[PDB]
Amino acid sequence: QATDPFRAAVEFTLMPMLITNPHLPDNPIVFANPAFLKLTGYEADEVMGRNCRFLQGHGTDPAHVRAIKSAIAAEKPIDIDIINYKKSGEAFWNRLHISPVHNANGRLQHFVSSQLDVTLELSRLVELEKERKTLSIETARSKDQLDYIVEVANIGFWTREFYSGKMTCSAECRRIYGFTPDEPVHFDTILDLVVLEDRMTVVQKAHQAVTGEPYSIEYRIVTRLGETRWLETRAKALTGENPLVLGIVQDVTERKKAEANKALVSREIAHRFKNSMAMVQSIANQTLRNTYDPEQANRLFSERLRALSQAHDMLLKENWAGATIQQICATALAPFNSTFANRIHMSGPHLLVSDRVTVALSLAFYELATNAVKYGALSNEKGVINITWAIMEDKGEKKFHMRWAESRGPEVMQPARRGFGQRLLHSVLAEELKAKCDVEFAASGLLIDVLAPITPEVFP
Amino acid sequence: QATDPFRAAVEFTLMPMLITNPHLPDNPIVFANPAFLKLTGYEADEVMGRNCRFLQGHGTDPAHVRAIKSAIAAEKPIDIDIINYKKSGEAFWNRLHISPVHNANGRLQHFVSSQLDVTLELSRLVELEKERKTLSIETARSKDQLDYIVEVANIGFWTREFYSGKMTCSAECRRIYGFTPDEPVHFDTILDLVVLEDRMTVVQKAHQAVTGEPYSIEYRIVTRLGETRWLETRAKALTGENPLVLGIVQDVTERKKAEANKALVSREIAHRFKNSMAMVQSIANQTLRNTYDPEQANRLFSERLRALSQAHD
Numbered sequence: 001q002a003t004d005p006f007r008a009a010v011e012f013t014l015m016p017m018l019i020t021n022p023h024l025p026d027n028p029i030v031f032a033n034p035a036f037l038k039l040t041g042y043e044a045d046e047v048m049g050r051n052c053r054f055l056q057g058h059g060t061d062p063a064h065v066r067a068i069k070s071a072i073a074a075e076k077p078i079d080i081d082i083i084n085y086k087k088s089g090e091a092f093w094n095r096l097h098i099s100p101v102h103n104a105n106g107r108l109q110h111f112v113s114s115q116l117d118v119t120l121e122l123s124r125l126v127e128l129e130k131e132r133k134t135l136s137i138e139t140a141r142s143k144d145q146l147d148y149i150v151e152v153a154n155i156g157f158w159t160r161e162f163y164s165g166k167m168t169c170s171a172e173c174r175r176i177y178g179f180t181p182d183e184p185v186h187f188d189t190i191l192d193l194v195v196l197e198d199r200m201t202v203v204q205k206a207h208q209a210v211t212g213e214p215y216s217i218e219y220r221i222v223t224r225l226g227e228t229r230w231l232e233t234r235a236k237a238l239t240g241e242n243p244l245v246l247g248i249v250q251d252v253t254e255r256k257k258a259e260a261n262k263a264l265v266s267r268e269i270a271h272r273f274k275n276s277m278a279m280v281q282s283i284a285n286q287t288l289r290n291t292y293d294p295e296q297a298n299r300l301f302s303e304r305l306r307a308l309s310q311a312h313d314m315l316l317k318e319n320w321a322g323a324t325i326q327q328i329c330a331t332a333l334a335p336f337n338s339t340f341a342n343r344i345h346m347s348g349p350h351l352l353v354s355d356r357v358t359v360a361l362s363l364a365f366y367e368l369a370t371n372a373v374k375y376g377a378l379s380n381e382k383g384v385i386n387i388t389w390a391i392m393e394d395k396g397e398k399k400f401h402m403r404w405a406e407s408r409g410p411e412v413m414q415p416a417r418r419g420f421g422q423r424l425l426h427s428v429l430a431e432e433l434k435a436k437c438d439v440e441f442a443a444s445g446l447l448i449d450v451l452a453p454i455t456p457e458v459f460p
Numbered sequence: 461q462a463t464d465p466f467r468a469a470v471e472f473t474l475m476p477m478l479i480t481n482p483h484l485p486d487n488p489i490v491f492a493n494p495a496f497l498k499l500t501g502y503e504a505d506e507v508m509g510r511n512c513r514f515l516q517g518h519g520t521d522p523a524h525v526r527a528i529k530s531a532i533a534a535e536k537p538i539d540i541d542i543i544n545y546k547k548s549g550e551a552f553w554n555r556l557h558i559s560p561v562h563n564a565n566g567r568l569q570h571f572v573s574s575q576l577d578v579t580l581e582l583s584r585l586v587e588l589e590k591e592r593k594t595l596s597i598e599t600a601r602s603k604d605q606l607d608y609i610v611e612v613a614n615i616g617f618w619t620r621e622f623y624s625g626k627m628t629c630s631a632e633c634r635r636i637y638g639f640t641p642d643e644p645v646h647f648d649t650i651l652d653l654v655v656l657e658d659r660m661t662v663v664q665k666a667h668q669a670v671t672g673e674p675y676s677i678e679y680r681i682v683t684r685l686g687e688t689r690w691l692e693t694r695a696k697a698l699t700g701e702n703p704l705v706l707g708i709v710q711d712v713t714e715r716k717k718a719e720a721n722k723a724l725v726s727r728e729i730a731h732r733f734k735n736s737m738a739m740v741q742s743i744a745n746q747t748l749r750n751t752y753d754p755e756q757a758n759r760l761f762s763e764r765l766r767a768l769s770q771a772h773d
């Protein structure tokens with residue numbers, strides 16, 4: 001009585017469909033629903049008895065055609081897109097969902113398909129690919145930029161799998177350590193380079209990095225070639241699936257090497273000043289004290305400081321490179337040689353002495369000569385002062401020797417005191433040379449002997 | 461052995477399809493292609509012998525259900541959209557394409573429908589509109605990771621667009637020069653700090669940067685505040701579409717003038733401390749004329765020697 005409803009499905013549905021017969025020769029379209037003929041534009045008889053192949057053309061990819069024909073003989077289904085041309089020739093994209101109808105025996109008997117004009121994704125490919133290409137070329141620009149800032153500037157780059165301990169070391173990182181460009185790295189291999197003082201800090205931090213919290217370490221290493229390097233390292237664990245700790249490691253040696261030296265400059269200055277400020281600790285200790293002549297004790301102070309400030313300018317012909325005894329023996333004893341012209345004699349080699357001794361020199365020179373004018377040989381008319389110094393030896397060393405000899409003076413009696421010089425000599429002149437100092441009050445003249453081992457804080 | 465190619469053509473198509481049986485109570489469903497059990501996620505035994513009504517729900521415009529019930533009654537086709545609900549509960553538009561099946565006399569025997577989801581269709585225009593921006597975010601992610609490394613490693617970085625002359629200056633680069641955190645830098649702002657005796661060298665190899673030939677240069681700048689600084693600039697040229705000149709700069713005013721630093725400091729830490737302590741002790745020159753000044757003229761001097769030893773502690 002009544003028809004088959006499944007034909008009314010394929011007949012009325014707006015989905016273009018097709019049936020073909022692979023027992024008829026060359027698999028011809030036996031059925032074409034009206035939608036397939038609204039899609040293609042051809043007429044009912046024009047698409048019957050022919051093979052679908054007729055929709056292809058010059059732009060139709062002859063590679064897709066192989067893929068379909070392959071599966072048809074395989075008797076397996078196939079989904080694929082291909083170019084087709086409307087009856088008016090207007091090409092479109094045709095998506096084919098092609099399936100093989102088997103019967104009860106298991107032998108093929110029909111092919112069925114569903115066709116769709118998926119020429120909307122054509123503009124979707126042109127949009128998506130044109131953009132996501134120029135955007136992955138935008139990235140390729142900011143790759144080479146980052147890559148270059150790491151060639152230069154030497155930026156190390158390491159990772160540690162927080163769960164397993166797997167490590168990755170970038171080339172600059174391997175360059176910063178003493179590492180072969182391709183040997184395996186673990187926490188192991190790095191810590192074996194950290195100086196023993198700084199190990200427990202590294203361990204405590206590498207076992208701390210569960211917090212996902214950016215830490216920052218400084219630690220020194222000793223490369224496999226004996227070189228020593230300071231390192232800053234900033235890390236920050238990225239929690240997630242495989243928790244990686246990501247770290248930056250850069251070499252900060254030239255900064256550290258130059259920091260801990262620029263402080264050494266102002267370190268000695270803070271030592272050459274609690275010695276020079278406390279140098280006048282003695283110059284004012286004795287001079288303007290409880291004297292019978294506070295008016296003349298500043299006639300003397302301004303004369304013993306006019307000589308200490310002479311012990312500062314000798315270090316200007318040479319950049320504090322000490323001075324020569326040949327120049328200092330002229331520095332402090334040229335004012336005397338005005339009145340006592342050619343009555344003080346200097347004998348010795350052209351030598352060299354550290355600048356923290358050239359100060360205690362031009363004072364002991366100026367002080368002892370002042371003693372010669374008061375009590376000693378530079379007081380009378382025909383007194384003379386003999387200064388001899390020469391490098392010689394006794395107990396195997398190459399030690400230093402000098403003599404203050406006062407000849408043709410007045411007979412030297414004995415001192416009833418032991419004033420400022422007699423300890424300016426034993427205490428801040430012997431402790432300026434590692435010296436063994438001596439004084440004899442011979443009746444003939446003042447005999448002063450000095451003996452100093454060579455330790456280039458005294459003899460450069 | 462004689463299977464139907466039509467019974468198999470709907471069997472396999474991806475268009476949801478229904479065939480109902482009006483000559484039965486309630487006009488129930490007696491066929492649903494698997495393309496229907498996907499669209500509604502229901503099992504097989506869950507849509508057979510039950511009216512297509514059961515897909516409707518609480519948000520279904522009833523004036524729609526009226527014209528559908530009306531066309532069914534009058535044996536007409538209908539092409540309408542209606543809000544239906546999946547087995548999950550998803551609120552999705554449903555495009556009903558319904559047709560009558562009139563037998564060989566003109567007598568309503570069957571009803572057929574091809575269902576079309578206009579929620580999976582009308583969303584793919586915004587399912588990859590959210591993909592065009594995932595790939596616009598990976599791009600901005602990589603220009604960021606650059607910016608991120610330049611910060612954490614505190615690196616003085618600069619980029620001169622070779623054609624245009626536009627420049628970008630990293631933070632540390634702007635701190636090395638005497639530069640505002642965000643002032644517009646070009647080549648002038650960097651040259652106006654160069655000392656006269658080094659401008660030619662800066663210029664000579666700033667035009668010699670065209671040929672992708674990496675170059676290093678040292679030169680002095682007098683900062684805006686008066687500080688003099690030595691800088692080593694290592695630069696290059698990436699030749700892509702528009703060539704970017706890549707360059708790094710670091711303050712070396714130390715590895716340079718440290719011979720003079722250590723020297724010309726003692727040349728003034730004694731130049732003005734011999735000069736500076738040779739007169740503060742001329743104050744003991746202005747306290748001595750009476751007696752017992754080693755009792756008060758030292759209470760008027762020892763308060764100046766740790767007034768300078770504490771001015772540096």
Ligand SMILES: Cc1cc2nc3c(=O)[nH]c(=O)nc-3n(C[C@H](O)[C@H](O)[C@H](O)COP(=O)(O)O)c2cc1C
Pocket residue numbers: 018019020027051052053055056065066068069072082083084094096098099111112113115
């Ligand atoms: C049911 C069915 C429908 C097909 N529909 C089309 C079609 O619409 N457009 C098309 O180019 N090819 C279609 N084909 C593929 C062609 O029929 C043919 O197989 C293709 O051109 C490759 O095979 P051939 O090299 O022997 O021609 C269809 C195939 C089958 C089995």
Ligand SMILES: Cc1cc2nc3c(=O)[nH]c(=O)nc-3n(C[C@H](O)[C@H](O)[C@H](O)COP(=O)(O)O)c2cc1C
Pocket residue numbers: 478479480511512513515516525528529532542544554556558559571572573575
């Ligand atoms: C072939 C066919 C398919 C139908 N498919 C749906 C459907 O998918 N969703 C829906 O809400 N209604 C569908 N209907 C409509 C409902 O079954 C029915 O018309 C609705 O309940 C309104 O009639 P009523 O007031 O008697 O319930 C379909 C009707 C037919 C004849």
Ligand SMILES: Nc1ncnc2c1ncn2[C@@H]1O[C@H](COP(=O)(O)OP(=O)(O)CP(=O)(O)O)[C@@H](O)[C@H]1O
Pocket residue numbers: 286368371372375376377406412414415416417418419420421422423446
């Ligand atoms: N060149 C010399 N020749 C002989 N005797 C000397 C001498 N220099 C010092 N004396 C003797 O040693 C004593 C103390 O020597 P010293 O020079 O250290 O103190 P002083 O009396 O000169 C006070 P001040 O040293 O502060 O000027 C003198 O009084 C003197 O007897």
Ligand SMILES: [Cl-]
Pocket residue numbers: 202206233247
């Ligand atoms: Cl670490």
Ligand SMILES: [Cl-]
Pocket residue numbers: 490491
């Ligand atoms: Cl049936």
Ligand SMILES: [Cl-]
Pocket residue numbers: 666693
């Ligand atoms: Cl430049």
Ligand SMILES: [Mg+2]
Pocket residue numbers: 367370371419420421
């Ligand atoms: Mg004396």
